[PDB]
Design a protein around this ligand. Structure first.
Ligand code: FES
Ligand SMILES: [K+]
Ligand SMILES: [Mg+2]
Ligand SMILES: [Mg+2]
Ligand SMILES: [Mg+2]
Lengths: 137, 96, 86, 133, 98
RNA sequence: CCCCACUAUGCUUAGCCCUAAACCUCAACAGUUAAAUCAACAAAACUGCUCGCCAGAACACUACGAGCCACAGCUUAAAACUCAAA
């Protein structure tokens, strides 16, 4: 059977399973990759928080939070605390274009979790609020 | 002399090219047809350089998509997964 | 917000190749114009500047395509000299 | 030597004026020949001009009656699988045979374009010419 | 006395009509390594690449089958008041005329 | 000039004010592509007809007068002295 790049539909029954569970039952790792910080929260499919880790909660301060290594460490910490609650497979939902967009996922993988899908949910207004003016540096 | 050329319109003139939707009605209720001209992953409407439509039908499709979206017939942020297996008419490849 | 989740901007991993899935997602977001929109929305672009930028980009594309067409059309003559010496 | 104002008059008028003015002692070798056998147009310099507005070139498109038949033949039976031989001054294509038969039927019958076409096709097939639509 | 109008009307080139996707017989008249210069009865010759199959058979004087695409390759370019011509015809080499 | 907070203002309703690189820096209509095309550059060169406007620089997008829901605001708009240039 040809691999489908598209995620499974909740309604349409599918045979894809991960440790016996359907796609819509897998825990979700929400990564928020800001410009100066990366925050990772693992939640259950029913939206029950299991683990949380940010670059600041891992000891990094000021500019050191906005690096790849800090996001990787936060990912490892989140993956460890999620492993301690029975999480193996995760669906990654990444929001933002910060330096830790990919390093947090790397840290999650090195912490033992298996990523089955990647979703981007970066906020894109259809021209709502007015952004701030450019910096005159 | 009878061998002189005569005035006429070009008889070898090939017919003008037509878009795939030429002569067909675009309805905002036909979510299936409108879904063939939006991105599967973002729901963004494809430009004419991708759809290959003429300006009139590009405008018709755009207006129909917006009408269906605001009147609760079509999703905005993605293509309805029920139409993901419909024939591909757009010249775009994600190498997925 | 009101839409179903895990349909838009979602990619499945093939045989644990997370890097390939991430790069495919980056390509999708780039060719759908979302990356440029996000980066251009960080600061407000004035309407006159926005219009000037779009006009410049459109005319740059047209000029570049015309130049490429001219070079490709004239490439056919670039072969070995058939009348060498004379 | 003569005047080097190539944009004033022609070589003939310049030379003739100089000769009669006494600047040139003798006529050049070509002057008498030009006198006896002049060109159709005097070679006077003229600056080509770009056309604007409603001005158009008077060059017409060369069309013949049979072109219509040819066109529709080429639209129905397509281009013949047989190859044109343009080196032969009297080459006869399948389309040209169809045209000659069409004109023959036209002068030996009525004027109904579709009927003429179908009848000519029947005649060519009877003669033994393959014609795949 | 045949007039020029009659000769033009009954000319094979005139009879051919449009030259697109028309099969013609051409003759090779010049060789430059693997470049074959072929005359097919038009104003300009066409230059084709020597086929990889039976390439040794393509020699000067050889008759070949061609698919004409354009009798003269011209195109007007941006900022030009006249067309630019490469002084060459466009055709596809099919094979040798048996 | 960077960072944070927060005003007038950007929004709606009913009134003012009447200014822009308000620019295609091309007045409106009708016509021509033949002429030597044509100071230059800009945006090929012209014709008929109408209205508006302009006659060295600066003084001066000024002063005075007049008009305006405008009150050191807008429109119209000079002179003297000075110079051989601009
Ligand atoms: S070309 Fe006919 S409607 Fe588009
Ligand atoms: K302007
Ligand atoms: Mg007026
Ligand atoms: Mg003055
Ligand atoms: Mg004033």
């Amino acid at each position: 059977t040809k691999f489908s790049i598209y995620p499974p539909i909740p309604g349409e029954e599918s045979s894809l399973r991960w440790a016996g569970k359907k796609f819509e039952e897998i825990p979700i790792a929400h990564i928020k990759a800001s410009h100066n910080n990366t925050q990772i929260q693992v939640v259950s499919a029913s939206n029950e928080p299991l683990a949380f880790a940010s670059c600041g909660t891992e000891g990094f301060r000021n500019a050191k939070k906005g690096t790849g290594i800090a996001a990787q460490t936060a990912g490892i910490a989140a993956a460890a605390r999620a492993k301690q609650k029975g999480v193996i497979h995760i669906r990654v939902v990444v929001k933002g274009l910060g330096p830790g967009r990919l390093s947090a996922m790397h840290g999650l993988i090195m912490g033992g979790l298996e990523v089955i899908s990647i979703t981007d949910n970066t906020p894109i207004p259809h021209n709502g609020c007015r952004p701030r003016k450019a910096r005159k540096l | 002399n009878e061998d002189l050329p005569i005035s006429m319109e070009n008889p070898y003139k090939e017919p003008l090219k037509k878009c795939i939707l030429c002569g067909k009605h675009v309805d905002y209720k036909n979510v299936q047809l409108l879904s063939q001209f939006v991105s599967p992953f973002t729901g963004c409407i494809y430009g004419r350089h991708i759809t290959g439509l003429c300006g009139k039908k590009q405008k018709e499709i755009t207006k129909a998509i917006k009408r269906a979206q605001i009147m609760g017939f079509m999703p905005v942020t993605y293509k309805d997964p029920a139409y993901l297996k419909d024939p591909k008419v757009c010249n775009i490849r994600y190498r997925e | 917000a009101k839409h179903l989740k895990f349909i838009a901007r979602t990619v499945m991993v093939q045989e644990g190749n997370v890097e390939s899935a991430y790069r495919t997602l980056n390509r999708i977001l780039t060719m759908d114009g979302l990356i440029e929109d996000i980066k251009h929305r960080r600061y407000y672009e004035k309407p006159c500047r926005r219009r000037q930028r779009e006009s410049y980009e459109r005319c740059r594309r047209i000029y570049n395509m015309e130049m490429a067409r001219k070079i490709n059309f004239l490439m056919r003559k670039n072969r070995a000299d058939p009348w060498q010496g004379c | 030597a003569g005047s080097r104002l190539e944009t004033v008059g022609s070589i003939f008028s310049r030379t003739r004026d100089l000769v009669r003015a006494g600047v040139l002692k003798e006529k050049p070798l070509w002057f008498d020949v030009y006198d006896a056998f002049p060109p159709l147009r005097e070679p006077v310099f003229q600056r080509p001009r770009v056309r604007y507005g409603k001005a158009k070139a008077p060059i017409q498109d060369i069309w013949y009656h049979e072109d219509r038949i040819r066109a529709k033949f080429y639209s129905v039976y397509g281009s013949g699988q047989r190859a044109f031989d343009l080196f032969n001054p009297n080459f006869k294509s399948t389309c040209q045979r169809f045209v000659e038969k069409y004109t023959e039927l036209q002068k030996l019958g009525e004027t109904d374009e579709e009927k003429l076409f179908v009848e000519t096709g029947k005649a060519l097939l009877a003669e033994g010419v393959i014609l795949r639509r | 006395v045949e007039s020029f109008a009659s000769m033009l009307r009954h000319s094979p080139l005139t009879q051919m009509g449009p030259a697109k996707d028309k099969l013609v017989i051409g003759r090779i008249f010049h060789i430059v390594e693997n470049d074959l210069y072929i005359d097919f009865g038009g104003k300009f010759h066409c230059v084709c690449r020597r086929p990889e199959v039976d390439g040794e058979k393509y020699q000067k004087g050889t008759r070949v089958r061609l698919r004409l695409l354009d009798l003269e390759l011209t195109s007007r370019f941006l900022g030009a008041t006249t067309d630019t011509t490469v002084l060459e015809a466009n055709a596809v080499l099919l094979g040798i005329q048996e």
